[PDB]
Each structure stands twice: as structure tokens, then as C-alpha cells.
């Protein structure tokens, strides 16, 4: 038993798994960045309300979204894979990667 850490430079990568993305509606502060009508996991170009809109490119089937907790980054659909997004914190201290629990 040891601490798990995932990080890119100064930015912690925080993997969070939910069985239902709708649980994140009750997950402060993150809920405020999710647009729960969107299909396909999104990442945020900034920490505006509802910022997680940019389609992550070729997302893992269990990827729900990416929230960077600060700063800004390039904002494009279907360009940045999750791996590339890990290089795109741009000063964000935390990259929250939300994952869907896959049962069975």
C-alpha cells in the first residue's frame, strides 16, 4: 500500500471513477463545469461555468470527461486525445479525469 500518484510536471492527475456520470451532478465543484447534455467526453479550455465542452479525441470508452482546474488551453473538438490533454494543463494544478466504472 503506497500513495498512488499520476502527474504531469506540477499538475496532479486525479482519476475519479463514477458508475454514472449523473452522479457528478452532485459533485462540487466539478458539476458546475459539466454540461450533462453533451455526448462524448469533453475537456475544458478554461474554468468558466460549463466549460467542459471540447470533444476529447478518440476517448477511451470509459472516459467521461476531463476537467483542468485552472488556466486555459487550446479549445478544439476531436483533436486532443486524453494523453495529449495531460500535457495541456497549462498551469492547471489538477487535471481531473472522470471515468466510468465498467461493471461486468
Amino acid at each position: 500500500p503506497a500513495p498512488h500518484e499520476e502527474r504531469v510536471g506540477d499538475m496532479r492527475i486525479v482519476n475519479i471513477t463514477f458508475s454514472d456520470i449523473n452522479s457528478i451532478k452532485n459533485f462540487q465543484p466539478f458539476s458546475q463545469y459539466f454540461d450533462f447534455t453533451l455526448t462524448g467526453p469533453r475537456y475544458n479550455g478554461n474554468i468558466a461555468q460549463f466549460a467542459m465542452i471540447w470533444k476529447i479525441k478518440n476517448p477511451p470508452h470509459n472516459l467521461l470527461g476531463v476537467f483542468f482546474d485552472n488556466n486555459t488551453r487550446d479549445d478544439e473538438d476531436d483533436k486532443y486525445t486524453l494523453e495529449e490533454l495531460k500535457q495541456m494543463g497549462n498551469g492547471a494544478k489538477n487535471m481531473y479525469i472522470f471515468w466510468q466504472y465498467e461493471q461486468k
Binding site: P1, R12, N15, T17, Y96
Partner: peptide, 13 residues
């Protein structure tokens, strides 16, 4: 530090 907290929840024994 919420990121630090939440990062603790990954990979529990």
C-alpha cells in the same frame, strides 16, 4: 487541496 484529497481515492487497497 481537493485534488490531493481526491487523488487519495484512486487505487485503494
Amino acid at each position: 487541496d481537493l485534488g490531493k484529497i481526491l487523488a487519495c481515492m484512486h487505487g485503494l487497497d
